[PDB]
Design a binder for these strands. Structure first.
Lengths: 49, 49, 44, 163, 195
RNA sequence: CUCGA
DNA sequence: GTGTCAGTAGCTGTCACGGATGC
DNA sequence: GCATCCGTGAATCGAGG
């Protein structure tokens, strides 16, 4: 949509809704979503740190 | 003489291969002097001759 | 107290800015005087 | 013309393809380290390019000369530069660890020295914590003395504590 | 080159890839990838997605991809590659010293060859060895066969200082050794209170 | 390397 | 300074799993 | 478009030589 989120990337459902919150209020299109299940290993490597 | 940082060449996925769209094996041949590679070609002069 | 830890690619210029000099000679030390050879891997 | 400066290369690349991959194995068996062999091979062939009086007589065995060149360089590496160092490796499981002592004593000593500094006068203090006669703006005999009496006050205090 | 050399330019080794990265429009390729992404077959869309994941990084962060090709390599301080003495008068040394030393040797030989105008074959076949040696310094064994030390033992690289249980992270950061501590055999003391 | 919970 | 053949040891007696690598 | 093959991972502390 109007987000800089690289399509296909797995993003925390908090930042997704916050960014679509800013964009929906900005006039641009909010990014689309789709729930994704990750295994513990893959989610551990996906941490922001 | 310049040298490539193996982490970005051989590490899977080959980061350089993804940046230049070059196959990992082609890149391997290039880096270790197994094949030449075309850096630039004056296509207009070639057209005129 | 320091907030963030940044990491990124090291430019050639950054590599040179870190170094206190180039390692020209391949020698390590002297095996008699225990002194590090000049411009070697242990140059003082 | 330029064809000759190219003929030089086309002459070297023609001995490479027939002798380098074989010379490597010789230095390999003699050093048990493919890396050094890789080094010695290039050193040898560089000298060869530097000594054309050997390849010119095409009809003679060149490989045979090459082997001796290498065999000599390897032992030149087995020289004094190898006898002392080649033994062990730190990250090799079998070597101690550079261990640094526990700073207990030094710290206790300084903790006492600091306790016999409150028992001083600021001037003896400023002098001891440093030719100094140039800054503090006094004589050098005043230095010598202040140093003398101050050190004796320090020894007095210390031995008072039982040092 | 002998025929149509006036029309193109070619090169070999790592310097060539340096040139390729130089003559590369990051933003343009990023937008090509995004165009492929908006409308494309999954088969040929996953590849483009993963490529964008790499390219957009260099695009936004403002760091040049040229960083992936090195003109200078750093030398780790000596105390982290220490050289200890043995009780027999002989010496033991960190593996990093052997690796750095081999790299320095090949680099100085490259300088010699460049100055002496050696045949192109030797210069190129030497640059390749310098490449392999820096590869070994950073992550020995990553490509092909590792650099054997004495006893056909693979030498430890810089990136070997960090991996696994013996790496810096798990061995010396997530868990240290502590002063004011002891250990001994345990015995049951029935008369003891719970606390 | 060999060994103890 | 070098010049007739002059050519690794070692080793596969691990495995599950995911995904880039390659035909 | 799909099979191959590459790389990743595989308990904790402790003793002596």
């Amino acid at each position: 949509g109007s987000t800089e989120f690289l399509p296909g990337s797995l993003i925390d459902r908090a930042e997704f809704e916050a960014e679509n919150r800013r964009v929906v209020a900005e006039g641009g299109e909010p990014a689309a979503g789709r729930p994704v299940l990750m295994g513990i290993t893959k989610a551990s490597l996906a941490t922001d740190s | 003489a310049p040298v490539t940082h193996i982490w970005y060449f051989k590490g899977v996925p080959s980061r350089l291969g993804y940046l230049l769209d070059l196959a990992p094996k082609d890149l391997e041949k290039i880096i270790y002097f197994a094949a030449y590679v075309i850096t630039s070609v004056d296509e207009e002069m070639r057209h005129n001759e | 107290f320091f907030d963030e830890l940044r990491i990124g690619l090291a430019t050639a210029e950054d590599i040179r800015q870190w170094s206190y000099g180039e390692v020209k000679k391949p020698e390590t030390i002297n095996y008699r005087t225990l002194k590090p050879e000049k411009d070697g891997l242990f140059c003082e | 013309v330029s064809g000759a400066a190219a003929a030089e290369a086309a002459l070297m690349r023609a001995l490479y393809d027939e002798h380098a991959a074989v010379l490597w194995r010789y230095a390999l068996r003699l050093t048990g380290d493919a890396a050094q062999a890789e080094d010695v091979v290039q050193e040898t062939l560089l000298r060869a390019w530097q000594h054309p009086e050997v390849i010119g007589d095409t009809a003679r065995p060149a490989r045979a000369w090459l082997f001796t060149v290498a065999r000599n360089m390897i032992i030149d590496e087995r020289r004094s530069a190898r006898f002392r160092n080649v033994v062990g490796s730190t990250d090799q499981s079998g070597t101690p660890e550079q261990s640094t002592p526990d700073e207990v004593n030094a710290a206790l000593d300084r903790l006492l020295i600091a306790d016999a500094l409150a028992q001083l006068s600021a001037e003896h203090r400023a002098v001891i914590q440093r030719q100094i006669a140039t800054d503090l703006g006094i004589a050098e005999g005043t230095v010598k003395s202040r140093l003398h009496y101050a050190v004796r006050a320090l020894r007095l205090t210390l031995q008072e504590l039982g040092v | 080159v002998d025929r149509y050399g006036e029309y193109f330019t070619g090169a070999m080794g790592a310097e060539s890839i340096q040139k390729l990265i130089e003559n590369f429009d990051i933003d343009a390729e990023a937008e090509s990838l995004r165009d492929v992404i908006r409308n494309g077959k999954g088969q040929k869309k996953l590849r483009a997605l993963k490529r964008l994941k790499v390219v957009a990084a260099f695009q936004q962060s403002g760091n040049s991809p040229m960083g992936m090709v090195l003109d200078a390599v750093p030398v780790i301080p000596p105390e982290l590659r220490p050289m200890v003495q043995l009780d027999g008068g002989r010496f033991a040394t960190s593996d990093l010293n052997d690796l750095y030393r081999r790299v320095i040797n090949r680099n100085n030989r490259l300088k010699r060859l460049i100055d002496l105008g050696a045949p192109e074959i030797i210069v190129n076949n030497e640059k390749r060895m310098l490449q392999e040696s820096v590869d070994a310094l950073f992550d020995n064994g990553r490509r092909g066969r590792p650099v054997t030390g004495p006893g056909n033992r693979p030498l430890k690289s810089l990136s070997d200082l960090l991996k696994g249980k013996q790496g810096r992270f798990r061995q010396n950061l997530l868990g240290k050794r502590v002063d004011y501590s002891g250990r001994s055999v345990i015995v049951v003391g029935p008369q003891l209170k719970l606390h």
